[PDB]
Structure 1
Amino acid sequence: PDWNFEKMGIGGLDKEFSDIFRRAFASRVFPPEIVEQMGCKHVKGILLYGPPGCGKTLLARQIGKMLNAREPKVVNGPEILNKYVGESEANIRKLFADAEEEQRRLGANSGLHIIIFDEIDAICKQRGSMAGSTGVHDTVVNQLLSKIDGVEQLNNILVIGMTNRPDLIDEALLRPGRLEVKMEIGLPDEKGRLQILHIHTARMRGHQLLSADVDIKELAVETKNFSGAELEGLVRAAQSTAMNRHIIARGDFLASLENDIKPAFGTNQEDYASYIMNGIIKWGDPVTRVLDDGELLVQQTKNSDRTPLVSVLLEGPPHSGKTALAAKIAEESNFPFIKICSPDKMIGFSETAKCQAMKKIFDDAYKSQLSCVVVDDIERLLDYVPIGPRFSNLVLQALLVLLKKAPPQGRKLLIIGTTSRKDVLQEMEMLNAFSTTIHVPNIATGEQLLEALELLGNFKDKERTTIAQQVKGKKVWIGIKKLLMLIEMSLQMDPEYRVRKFLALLREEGA
């Protein structure tokens, strides 16, 4: 048995490699004298899927190193497509034909010619047969499988499939014998990451550049979700500070410093700022009780085995910063995975491009254990307008099934809408699908207003005395983003005229 992971190359996924070893590759490592009776033909092909950056391509070559081929030829799918019809399929034919010579020449004792596809998922779209929608590339796959399971079948081969979209592949491409067996890779647990860190450090520890104040046990777990690929870049970044340390003139952690730089596959901390200008200004009880409620039912999820999915939307009148509150609710529990979906970046897209950004985000999210995702300004991406009813049916349809779509077993998430008007939604039947709602009343009163202004501190006691004298009495109904807007508009004034400008403008709010 040659399958031990004390060999350094990869780690953390030990069970999955064990499995392929268990049922996939046992035939090829066993004394053949027995099986030569049984005539058991080997797996010709295998599939493994998972997130992109989790070190799958070093598995394949490692089994090639483990059980020696001449060498791998690795290819990328898009590296072969041609406008000219003949060329693309022919390339594949060359790849296979390299082996057939040895197989027929040297019979059935030949060594493996191994193949790897970096991503199939474009080429292996599931063709379907009818007069229309035959397909664009539906004829390359025929040549492929005809090589795999075809006439003059060969036992001289091994082929590795790779994808991040396992469901689009045709079911016959992967029927048993052509590729029988599938494995899932999922983003590694902290144990796998401490192994990986042991790996990439193993030279540094030996060369003793980094001798001190370095613990992988904490430094692994402080990140709950990363890809093993980024960590090597991280280690390279960790290597960069010692070289950026000698710009001034034997190694230090800069990891705690640099982790803020890195966009993860998972959570990001640097996207708040555009959404959070000012932080969370608590003007009164409703604000704090709301985000307290957020902190309340988040625990529901994290402590629930029977409700993986939960959902709310923060409704309220406009310009109350519901977006910001949702962002804070995300930021409050230090989740593994948080992400924004917003029209800001999906701008100027068709009804089926933004959908494919959205399915991308959630199926990206499904495979994390615990997550919080947020969608802002539902009305906008739904492309709602009152004059005419107009919207894209596609979007809400594909959205609400996701609100009713449970992720795979053992993974849980909550989802957050910021919709500012729900009458449409009640009419449009998204509101029965959401579990529950939050009214976010905008500030209704001056006694709360001046309090907030004291928290900001723009205005003096006299400037504030002005307000306190004139109106205690009105109930002003105002969204706060507008408040900030016009104080900044009055903050520029002749000081004597500063305040009553604010007041006069403020009395134009309506209702």
Structure 2
Amino acid sequence: DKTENDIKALQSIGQLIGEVMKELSEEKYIVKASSGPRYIVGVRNSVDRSKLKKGVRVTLDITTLTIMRILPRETDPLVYNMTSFEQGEITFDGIGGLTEQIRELREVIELPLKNPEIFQRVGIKPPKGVLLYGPPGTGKTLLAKAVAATIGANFIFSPASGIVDKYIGESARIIREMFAYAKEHEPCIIFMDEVDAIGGRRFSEGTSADREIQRTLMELLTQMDGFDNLGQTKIIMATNRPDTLDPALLRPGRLDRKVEIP
């Protein structure tokens, strides 16, 4: 049966995956293909038209261009960026000696992710971003693994130079991902590792193709000021020195927490 199921698995065909853009009619929908073209697709009796509306990722057909099945919504399923590969090594007792600054982080991180009603009773909004800086060699890299060894929630590691891969519209889309997955995967914590790049003013010498990085900074600034519900998701951004970061971010309204590790 295992060998016969191999032929049965090869009899199946491919299925196109796309997201619904606009609803043309009851049986007529407009779904954008993953390659970027759009088509008017039909419906079947095996799917529910209530979940076929806009903002929901569906499955199309590669032959007749029709809706076949329904899949859960995943923007760009890159797991290595979503999973942080947690292996417990260093805990809060291994980062000790920083306790003056350790008890400072747990109040704006562990407390709002546990009992959020404390900040709601006073009326203050929970802090979004937290800045961890200091001299090199103080364990700022270990701060990501120490906090992650306790809460045990999801953690998204997003290196600076790993997301700068040159593509059309992809550089600004990667930031949109982490805030889009934060609703379905729970707010948890999003981590940024040693970003010296996007925080620059970037006077124009020709920029040498780096204009794709400029829209990356614009997406990060508009996200904090966006109308979407935020404040539950924590943004941990670490860097060697703060001045290289965007002064628009350092000012209040986006990054409310500057935590020094001297």
Q: Which residue of 1 aligns with 2:5?
A: none
What TM-score comes out, normalization by structure 2 length? Answer: 0.59
Q: Which residue of 2 aligns with 1:412?
A: 232
Q: Does 1:435 align with 2:256?
A: yes
Q: Which residue of 2 aligns with 1:477?
A: none
**3-state secondary structure, aligned to 1:434:** coil
Q: Which residue of 2 aligns with 1:290?
A: 101
Q: 1:347 to 1:333 in 2, by over 3 A?
A: same
Conserved? CA contact 1:311–1:416, under 8 Å: yes
Could you tell me which of 403, 414, 419 is aligned with 2:224?
403
Q: What does the per-residue CA deviation read over 1:264-284, in whole Å, with 9 as the maximum and x for residues that have no partner? A: 9975444788xx8x9985473
Conserved? CA contact 1:366–1:408, under 8 Å: no
Q: Which residue of 2 aligns with 1:326?
A: 144
**3-state secondary structure, aligned to 1:379:** coil
Question: How far apart, in 1, do the equivalents of 2:146 and 2:135 lie?
Answer: 19
Conserved? CA contact 1:125–1:168, under 8 Å: no
Q: What does the per-residue CA deviation read over 1:205-249, in whole Å, with 9 as the maximum and x for residues that have no partner? A: xxxxxxxxxxxxxxxxxxxxxxxxxxxxxxxxxxxxxxxxxxxxx
Conserved? CA contact 1:308–1:406, under 8 Å: no
Could you tell me which of 121, 124, 130 is aligned with 1:312?
130
Question: How far apart, in 2, do the equivalents of 1:302 and 1:349 lie?
Answer: 39
1:48-67 correspondence to structure 2 within 5 Å: none
1:42-53 correspondence to structure 2 within 5 Å: none
Q: Which residue of 2 aligns with 1:377?
A: 194
Q: What does the per-residue CA deviation read over 1:306-336, in whole Å, with 9 as the maximum and x for residues that have no partner? A: 446622111223454423213322333222x
Could you tell me which of 99, 115, 123 is aligned with 1:303?
115
Q: Does 1:364 align with 2:262?
A: no
Question: How far apart, in 2, do the equivalents of 1:124 and 1:438 lie?
Answer: 45
Instruction: Tell me which amino acid in the other structure corresponds to 1:121.
Output: E
Question: How far apart, in 1, do the equivalents of 2:187 and 2:177 lie?
Answer: 17
1:364 Cα deviation after fit: 1.6
Question: How far apart, in 1, do the equivalents of 2:48 and 2:81 lie?
Answer: 25
Structure with the largest fraction of helix: 1
Could you tell me which of 166, 172, 175 is aligned with 2:55?
166
**3-state secondary structure, aligned to 1:326:** helix
Q: Does 1:425 align with 2:245?
A: yes
Could you tell me which of 19, 24, 46 is aligned with 1:121?
19
Q: Identity rate of aligned residues, in percent?
A: 18
**3-state secondary structure, aligned to 1:322:** coil
Conserved? CA contact 2:130–2:255, under 8 Å: yes
Instruction: Tell me which amino acid in the other structure corresponds to 1:303.
Output: N
**3-state secondary structure, aligned to 1:417:** strand
Could you tell me which of 23, 30, 37 is aligned with 1:137?
37
Question: How far apart, in 2, do the equivalents of 1:346 and 1:136 lie?
Answer: 21
Instruction: Tell me which amino acid in the other structure corresponds to 1:366.
Output: K
Question: How far apart, in 2, do the equivalents of 1:324 and 1:387 lie?
Answer: 34
**3-state secondary structure, aligned to 1:312:** strand
Which structure is larger by alpha-carbon Rg, 1 or 2?
A: 1
Question: How far apart, in 1, do the equivalents of 2:107 and 2:164 lie?
Answer: 34
Conserved? CA contact 1:313–1:438, under 8 Å: yes
Conserved? CA contact 1:373–1:415, under 8 Å: yes
Instruction: Tell me which amino acid in the other structure corresponds to 1:294.
Output: L
Conserved? CA contact 2:190–2:233, under 8 Å: yes
Q: 1:159 to 1:352 in 2, by over 3 A?
A: same
1:494-505 correspondence to structure 2 within 5 Å: none
Instruction: Tell me which amino acid in the other structure corresponds to 1:371.
Output: C
Question: How far apart, in 2, do the equivalents of 1:413 and 1:348 lie?
Answer: 25
Q: What does the per-residue CA deviation read over 1:24-83, in whole Å, with 9 as the maximum and x for residues that have no partner? A: xxxxxxxxxxxxxxxxxxxxxxxxxxxxxxxxxxxxxxxxxxxxxxxxxx97543xxxxx
**3-state secondary structure, aligned to 2:101:** helix
Question: How far apart, in 1, do the equivalents of 2:47 and 2:106 lie?
Answer: 49
Conserved? CA contact 1:77–1:120, under 8 Å: no
Q: What does the per-residue CA deviation read over 1:170-205, in whole Å, with 9 as the maximum and x for residues that have no partner? A: xxxxxxxxx9xxx9979xxxxxxxxxxxxxxxxxxx
Instruction: Tell me which amino acid in the other structure corresponds to 1:137.
Output: P
Q: 1:300 to 1:318 in 2, by over 3 A?
A: same
What TM-score comes out, normalization by structure 1 length? Answer: 0.33
1:77-96 correspondence to structure 2 within 5 Å: 77-78=15-16
Q: 1:159 to 1:332 in 2, by over 3 A?
A: closer
**3-state secondary structure, aligned to 1:302:** coil
**3-state secondary structure, aligned to 1:296:** helix
Structure 2 unaligned regions, length at least 5: 1-11, 21-29, 59-66, 74-78
Instruction: Tell me which amino acid in the other structure corresponds to 1:430.
Output: L
Conserved? CA contact 2:86–2:145, under 8 Å: no
Question: How far apart, in 2, do the equivalents of 1:363 and 1:264 lie?
Answer: 16
Question: How far apart, in 1, do the equivalents of 2:175 and 2:36 lie?
Answer: 26
1:378 Cα deviation after fit: 1.9
Q: What does the per-residue CA deviation read over 1:101-151, in whole Å, with 9 as the maximum and x for residues that have no partner? A: xxxxxxxxxxxxxxxxxx33388129xxxxxxxx9633x31xx35xx6xxx
What is the Cα-based RMSD across aligned positions, in Å?
4.7
Instruction: Tell me which amino acid in the other structure corresponds to 1:310.
Output: K
Instruction: Tell me which amino acid in the other structure corresponds to 2:19.
Output: D
Conserved? CA contact 1:366–1:407, under 8 Å: no
Q: 1:124 to 1:386 in 2, by over 3 A?
A: closer
